[PDB]
Ligand binder design. Sequence first.
Ligand SMILES: NC(=O)c1ccc[n+]([C@@H]2S[C@H](COP(=O)(O)OP(=O)(O)OC[C@H]3O[C@@H](n4cnc5c(N)ncnc54)[C@H](O)[C@@H]3O)[C@@H](O)[C@H]2O)c1
Length: 249
Amino acid sequence: SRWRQQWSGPGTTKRFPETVLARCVKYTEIHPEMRHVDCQSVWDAFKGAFISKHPCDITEEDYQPLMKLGTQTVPCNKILLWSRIKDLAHQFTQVQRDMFTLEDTLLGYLADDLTWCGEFATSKINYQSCPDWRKDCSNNPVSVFWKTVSRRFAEAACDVVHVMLDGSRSKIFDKDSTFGSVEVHNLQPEKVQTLEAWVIHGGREDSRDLCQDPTIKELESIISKRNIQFSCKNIYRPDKFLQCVKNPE
Ligand SMILES: NC(=O)c1ccc[n+]([C@@H]2S[C@H](COP(=O)(O)OP(=O)(O)OC[C@H]3O[C@@H](n4cnc5c(N)ncnc54)[C@H](O)[C@@H]3O)[C@@H](O)[C@H]2O)c1
């Protein structure tokens, strides 16, 4: 458009509509329980959330239509959260197939690793640039999507929730993360009894107990205040943790 400003973030991912549709079909092919879903309606509601809208004023209410159509019941006691250890978290749920990350749900599978935005009063997707959360604005279509769906996934969890955390990082638990700033605060104390952390070892540092780390202690404190118990395990050898998950016989 004639009035469209430059943003600092990458533009909408190449072939976005077509990638979303193909993913919706693919997901429902592999997951027979979701075949009631009309993928054209799914796309049309996703689109309705952000096109013709200034992409610094996107709200949770904008995505409500998408949320309704994406309604999915996962077994609430088989939930895996994670923070900066994507590869191992999803390798885990590929093998232990009764456990679920957000990206194993429909809505999460669709949006995984994609960028998108539009512009006020146009029907056009902006392929040139999109708002960066830091340099531009926080209420952008991508950020608002993930905080909305991450809240609802956490709200649905029950009994024992597991979180996988990256032990090679400087801040093993990080307040400024989806886990740290959305999910820990929206687990329901009525439904959830325990949050169990799995700290995955790697990188340079020599082998020590990482459940004694200052960020883990901070985490323990944050969740205790919410009246939910905390547990923590070291996973020293990720290599052999998958081997005995995938072949316990
Ligand atoms: N808001 C988002 O941009 C976003 C994007 C993708 C996924 N998610 C949420 S975060 C949650 C787990 O991640 P986290 O707890 O570490 O939260 P985060 O905000 O630190 O990470 C989210 C995203 O940041 C992105 N990112 C991380 N590091 C970099 C980086 N160094 N350069 C560019 N992008 C980066 C990457 O796409 C990652 O998936 C995941 O399951 C989803 O529910 C949020």
